[PDB]
Amino acid sequence: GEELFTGVVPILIELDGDVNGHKFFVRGEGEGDATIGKLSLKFIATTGKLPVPWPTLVTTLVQAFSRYPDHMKRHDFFKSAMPEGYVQERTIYFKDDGTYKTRAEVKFCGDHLVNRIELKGIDFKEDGNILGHKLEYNFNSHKVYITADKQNNGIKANFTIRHNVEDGSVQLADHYQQNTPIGDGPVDLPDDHYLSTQTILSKDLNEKRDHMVLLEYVTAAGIT
């Protein structure tokens, strides 16, 4: 399973979104290198201008590419579920605003890792930080706390994303995560640990479509 990740893996991502009735579709393509915990991806909104800020979509848009140091290999649920993959479900509570509910299927199809997701958002304020497009185009570093979920043969994750707002304030998004293996087969169930993340967002200056270029480094830690 971790065998599928010894080198560079091409990635396809597709997000079917609905936020307060506003419908959008995003496609991403690029590559992940789990030996160094690196993701390089470009996303396009194929439906025109997004109704939500790009940074609110970052956590939704493949943690199998986290670098798990050698002494932590037995704790890497994400890779062990491959190639059949895992379902990743989240509820994201934007503080003083609406919620995202996401379901994604992450698997291999031949040589590509594929992440297909539907996202539904409700209860957002039309003049809030999200529909009012008031979030800075950057992304902070976080700790994704992972715990085993033996009942469901998977894992759970909890973490709070901090979104910088244009006026200097911070928009919190509380993430509640569950992953379940898709196929029957042994999976690694981890002890408590976290993923430490870093993300940098840029633009293609010759790209006229609404888009986000992303580079991300992730390392598992919290086990000495």
Determine contact, residues 165/135, Cβ cutoff 8 Å: yes
Among 116, 125, 134, 156, binds its own copies (CB under 8 A): 116
At closest approach, how far in Å is the CB of 41 from Cu ion?
11
If the CB atoms of residues 15 and 157 are measured against its own copies, the closer one turns out to be 15
What SS3 state is found at 30?
strand
Q: Which stretch binds its own copies (CB under 8 A): 47-55, 56-64, 192-200, 204-212?
A: 204-212
If the CB atoms of residues 191 and 204 are measured against its own copies, the closer one turns out to be 204
Determine contact, residues 55/157, Cβ cutoff 8 Å: no
Decide if residue 107 touches its own copies (CB under 8 A). Answer: yes
CA–CA distance from 180 to each of 5, 54, 94, 193 (Å)? 19, 26, 24, 18
Decide if residue 162 touches its own copies (CB under 8 A). Answer: no
Determine contact, residues 37/67, Cβ cutoff 8 Å: yes
Look at residue 109 and give the partner it binds from Cu ion, its own copies, none, a contact being a CB closer than 5 to 8 Å depending on partner kind. Answer: its own copies
Cα separation, 8 vs 36, in Å, equals 10
If the CB atoms of residues 105 and 149 are measured against its own copies, the closer one turns out to be 105
Cα separation, 210 vs 165, in Å, equals 20
Nearest to 78 by CA among 64, 68, 91, 94: 64
**What count of other Cβ atoms lies within 10 Å of the Cβ of residue 122?**
12
Among 111, 126, 167, 184, binds its own copies (CB under 8 A): 111
At closest approach, how far in Å is the CB of 61 from its own copies?
16
Decide if residue 105 touches its own copies (CB under 8 A). Answer: yes
Decide if residue 109 touches its own copies (CB under 8 A). Answer: yes
Decide if residue 109 touches Cu ion (CB under 5 A). Answer: no
Cα separation, 205 vs 214, in Å, equals 14
Among 1, 7, 10, 131, binds Cu ion (CB under 5 A): 10
Look at residue 224 and give the partner it binds from its own copies, Cu ion, none, a contact being a CB closer than 5 to 8 Å depending on partner kind. Answer: none
CA–CA distance from 164 to each of 17, 151, 171, 198 (Å)? 23, 37, 6, 15
If the CB atoms of residues 95 and 203 are measured against its own copies, the closer one turns out to be 203
The site for Cu ion (CB under 5 A) is made up of 10, 12, 14, 112
Binding site for its own copies (CB under 8 A): 10, 12, 14, 27, 29, 85, 105, 107-112, 114, 116, 182, 206-209
